[PDB]
Design a protein around this ligand. Structure first.
Ligand code: SF4
Ligand SMILES: O=S([O-])[O-]
Ligand SMILES: [Cl-]
Ligand code: NA
Ligand code: NA
Length: 406
């Protein structure tokens, strides 16, 4: 009936029931930090592996970290960004908009269909992971996609509408969903409480690797700063041969909910990028500089807009040419996903700051991890997907947009 009820019905089946399916769950980071609040505790007061244990006790056959999907998104979108940059250094338009927030995608399609060509063709992390589970993992385990159920726990309900886009299906059969059911943080919390499960008192469980082999979640130790920042890093580090530090965006004067930064990029010596330098949105042709000796570069102008109302104001200035950016992330909630509409309600005005702070442990925050270094990701491309942006990657991990909405 409801997606929660459908999910629980599948989990209710005995595992030796002939009609039992292989029921998988994936979990967003914003969920892991906020779920403790459903018990009246502080953000982060329950550990990620306590949650994994709780989910396994509900009956899930696989418990995945959505960050695995996010590593795919970083690979694809980093490649996409670099490709667009390359094309515009040679004379797929710039600026490029990210695509992970379904609140943005809905407003894009309904109110800004002329901007569609500028948006990343990448699916979200949850949809990339889901597509891979019902293709690669299904084949590896010898399970018919028909007998796989994919559930995600998300900080917002509208990840369901993302999941429901018709062509997010297996082998062109729209009844065979890549991602079946989305459950929110609060909904999951209520499931635990109704069953007398206290997450804070559980032993640590374990994650499953979407590759179907190896221990753990298939995600390396450390943090990325998110999909937008890591897509940037991927492109930057290839272009320059130098590391991109963790970003610190600064607030824009006289524009609510907008943060920005400028990234100067000098092409790596002897690279093709060094040789290269040597529509509705008025793109100024990029911000370029050059030195006397011939060591010039380009400056990449980046923006993050949180809140759709705030995003509309940014778009107006961009259309007017009063604001120039090359890469832009639009998220529908003011604090981003930690502030999603499926999150617990608090009287604390600073709850989203507490959630953001508890999102990752300090040890992991001191380690920068990079998607292309993940052996599980490497394996998937080497043995199944081929190349980022290739045909197979396009089929499974990329999407399109529909003027007027779906
Ligand atoms: S910003 Fe809000 S609507 Fe968008 S993906 Fe995050 S929680 Fe969902
Ligand atoms: O989609 S809602 O939960 O913000
Ligand atoms: Cl996602
Ligand atoms: Na299992
Ligand atoms: Na495991």
């Amino acid at each position: 009936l409801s997606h929660v009820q459908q999910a629980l019905a599948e989990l209710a089946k005995p595992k030796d029931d002939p009609t039992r399916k292989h029921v998988c769950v994936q979990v967003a980071p914003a969920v892991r930090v906020a779920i403790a609040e459903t018990l009246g505790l502080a953000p982060g007061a329950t550990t990620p592996k306590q949650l994994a244990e709780g989910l396994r006790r509900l009956g899930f056959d696989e418990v995945f970290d959505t960050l695995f999907g996010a590593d795919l998104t970083i690979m694809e979108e980093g490649s996409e960004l670099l490709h667009r940059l390359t094309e515009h250094l040679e004379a797929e338009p710039l600026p490029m908009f990210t695509s992970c927030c379904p609140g943005w995608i809905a407003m894009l399609e309904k109110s800004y269909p002329d901007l569609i060509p500028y948006v990343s063709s990448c699916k979200s992390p949850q949809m990339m992971l889901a597509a891979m589970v019902k293709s690669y993992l299904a084949e590896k385990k010898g399970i018919a996609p028909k007998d796989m159920v994919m559930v995600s726990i998300m900080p917002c309900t509208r990840k369901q509408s993302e999941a429901d886009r018709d062509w997010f299906c297996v082998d062109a059969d729209p009844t065979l969903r890549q991602l079946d059911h989305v459950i929110t943080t609060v909904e999951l919390g209520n499931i635990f409480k109704e069953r007398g499960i206290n997450l804070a008192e559980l032993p640590e469980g374990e994650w499953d690797n979407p590759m179907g082999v190896g221990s753990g979640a298939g995600v390396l130790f450390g943090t990325t700063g998110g999909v937008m920042e890591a897509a940037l890093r991927t492109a930057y580090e290839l272009f320059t041969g130098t590391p991109l530090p963790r970003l610190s965006l600064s607030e824009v004067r006289g524009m609510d909910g907008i943060k920005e930064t400028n990234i100067t990029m000098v092409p790596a010596p002897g690279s093709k990028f060094e040789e290269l330098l040597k529509g509705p949105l008025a793109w100024d042709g990029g911000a370029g500089f050059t030195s006397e000796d011939g060591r010039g570069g380009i400056t990449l102008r980046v923006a993050v807009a949180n809140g759709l109302g705030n995003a509309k104001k940014l778009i107006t200035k961009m259309q007017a040419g009063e604001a120039k950016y090359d890469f832009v992330e639009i998220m529908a909630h003011p604090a981003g996903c930690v502030g999603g509409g499926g999150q617990p309600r608090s009287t604390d005005k600073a709850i989203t700051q507490k959630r953001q702070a508890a999102l990752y442990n300090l040890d992991e925050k001191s380690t920068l991890r990079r998607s292309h270094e993940n052996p599980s990701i490497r394996e998937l491309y080497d043995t199944y997907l081929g190349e980022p942006l290739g045909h197979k990657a396009h089929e499974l991990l990329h999407t399109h947009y529909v003027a007027g909405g779906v």
